[PDB]
Specification:
The structure is cut from a larger assembly and holds 3 copies of chain A. With about 500 residues, chain A is of the alpha+beta class. In chain A, about 30% of the residues lie in helices and about 15% in strands. Chain A contains 13 helices and 17 strands. In chain A, a hairpin with a 5-residue loop joins strand 6 (about 205-210) and strand 7 (about 215-225). The interface of A and B includes residues 88, 245, 255 and 258 of A. Chain A: This is Capsid protein precursor.
């Protein structure tokens, strides 16, 4: 093409010998091309910080359940007539007791995968990614130095969680457990390179069993460590020791576990992976899970019994089953759009438009479309507040998958000295108030987010413009997705997750 | 002879009572008239019987 | 003699402190009355000891 380069190849060789592959996890100063430009102090951005970790903070859901015609009540009927017709005898439980046992088993398995990922991250080292492993330990909520100093007690605790939770039976033919294990036991790169950026899934809350005696059962939230909490082994021990406190030496739980063990054999049970001081998970490339992260759609913080919601009493998230309410059905319709305060976070107004399903290539199979929409949750109506005065605005969806996303947490390095880890928590929607300092901070966050390849699509509202701007994402072959289509897809995937191949 | 320290139902012998009760109950299908704890206290009284037998058997076997 | 520049946990001296403390303490069942920074300070004081030895033996070998 150029005949001069073939005549002087040494000139072209030595002139373009540049050091590439800068290690990520570091602050880099670019310097000045105009030496005089130090008189223009903040007008010259000589800084460069590449992020490494985006943790998707999820909540495991049973799907939306208003009555007995719900997919998990139908699945409760199906698994109860399966288990009851292998364990002939006098059962002392209903459909709903067995299905709430099978839902508490999922929170136990996700907790085991969570602490096992805490151990398996701590052995990760790469000289070209300085986020390994302390940023992945900060994003999970643990104190990284506590895992390094107290390694053998952490390994004993994780092996004891796998031995205690492994004493119970849960059917492996239910793909609910396999999907949650695939999300929780996974380190995912956004691009298949060496200095790639890492996606993680972490449970925001887990579902805590409590037997209400005559008035049924309840699954109440148990909150997990958020990022930057510096939680020690004693805190995770307290979390495990009130997660299984109602279950570990219990009569009825043992009867249900033995019934599930006789119905589904030992080869058809959910297995727990053990640790042996050499267990090391490696960051894999999985474009199926990156499509779900791209179409992920945050719903807000969980509402608890202690949460203050002015105008919304009794809106806490719970999987309830009362025999005197809704014909004894498992009930779960959580209210979304809550961010932890009483101020009407009005970035959630930007989620009231229809979503964009962005997806790569030109040919999109049915499994790809049904898998990419798993973390997508669109609001449908406003929740009606109880009272004339109401400080927040809540929303009701048109259904949701087996997980909803509560938050995302980004880990990058600080551009000021010392260059420690910065933790940024955000929804898909981001409010930018009218202040001087948060415009360039929102630019920092936006450029940090676009470093991640198939990142969630952002919505940005402004204070003085009084308007949201729509999907901030690079598009592809896209489509506009409506609430009834996503509701049908959610129905299909809640049905497929809890399906057991039966004999009757 | 001790069963270990036991403050609540999350103790190792209550977990073992649950384990041995769901083993025994799922071979003997029927109407059981006992709980986990009745079966485990039976299995703990069996140990005192066996230690007593070993004790008097050692009394005999020493004398020769 | 320097351990390199160090102002946070991502320093090569701190990564080396963790990497040698895991080998001494956890992989070889060491004692638990010190942390990784104590082990690395000990490993750095040994270097000054050895540099003093090389210094005085160079003084010895030059004089002949």
């Amino acid at each position: 093409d150029v005949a001069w380069y073939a005549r002087y190849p040494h000139i072209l060789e030595e002139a373009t010998r540049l050091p590439f592959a800068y290690p990520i996890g570091q602050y880099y100063d670019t310097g000045y091309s105009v030496a005089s430009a130090t008189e223009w102090s903040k007008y010259v951005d000589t800084s460069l910080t590449i992020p490494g970790v985006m943790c998707v903070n999820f909540t495991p859901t049973p799907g939306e359940s208003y009555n007995k015609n719900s997919p998990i009540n139908i699945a409760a009927q199906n698994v109860y007539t399966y288990v009851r017709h292998m364990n002939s005898g006098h059962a002392n439980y209903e459909q709903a007791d067995l299905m709430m046992y099978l839902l508490a088993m999922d929170s136990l398995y996700i907790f085991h995968s969570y602490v096992r990922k805490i151990l398996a991250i701590s052995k990760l080292y790469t000289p070209v990614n300085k986020y390994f492993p302390r940023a992945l330990l900060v994003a999970l909520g643990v104190d990284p130095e506590d895992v390094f100093a107290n390694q053998a007690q952490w390994e004993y605790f994780v092996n004891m969680v796998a031995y205690r939770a492994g004493a119970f039976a849960a059917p492996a033919s239910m793909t609910y457990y396999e999907r949650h294990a695939w999300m929780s036991n996974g380190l995912y790169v956004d691009q298949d390179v060496t200095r790639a950026q890492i996606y993680m899934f972490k449970p925001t809350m887990l579902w805590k069993y409590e037997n209400l005696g005559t008035t049924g059962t309840k699954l109440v939230p148990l909150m997990m460590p958020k990022a930057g909490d510096n939680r020690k082994l004693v805190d995770f021990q307290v979390l495990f020791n009130n997660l299984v406190s109602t279950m570990l030496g219990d009569e009825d739980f043992g009867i249900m576990s033995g019934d599930v063990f006789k119905a589904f054999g030992a080869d058809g049970l959910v297995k727990l992976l053990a640790v042996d001081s050499t267990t090391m998970t490696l960051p894999t490339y999985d474009p199926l899970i990156l499509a779900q992260i791209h179409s992920a759609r945050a719903v807000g913080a969980p509402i608890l019994e202690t949460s203050t919601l002015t105008g919304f009493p009794g809106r806490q998230w719970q999987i309830t089953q009362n025999p005197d309410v809704n014909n004894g059905a498992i009930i779960f319709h959580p209210s979304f759009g809550y961010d932890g305060q009483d101020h009407e976070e009005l970035s959630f107004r930007a989620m009231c438009s229809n979503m964009i399903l962005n997806l790569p290539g030109e040919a999109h199979s049915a499994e790809m479309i049904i898998e990419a929409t798993r973390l997508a949750t669109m609001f449908q109506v406003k929740a009606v507040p109880a009272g004339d005065t109401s400080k927040p605005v809540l929303y009701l969806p048109n259904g949701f998958g087996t997980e909803v996303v509560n938050d995302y947490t980004m880990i990058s390095v600080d551009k000021a000295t010392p260059h420690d880890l910065t933790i940024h928590t955000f929804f898909n929607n981001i409010l930018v108030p009218n202040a001087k300092e948060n415009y360039v901070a929102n630019l920092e966050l936006l450029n940090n987010i676009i470093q991640f390849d198939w990142a969630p699509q952002l919505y940005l509202t402004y204070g003085i413009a009084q308007e949201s701007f729509g999907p901030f994402a690079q598009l592809n072959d896209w489509t506009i997705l409506t609430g009834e289509t996503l509701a049908r897809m959610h129905e299909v995937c809640v049905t497929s997750m809890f399906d057991v191949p039966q004999m009757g």
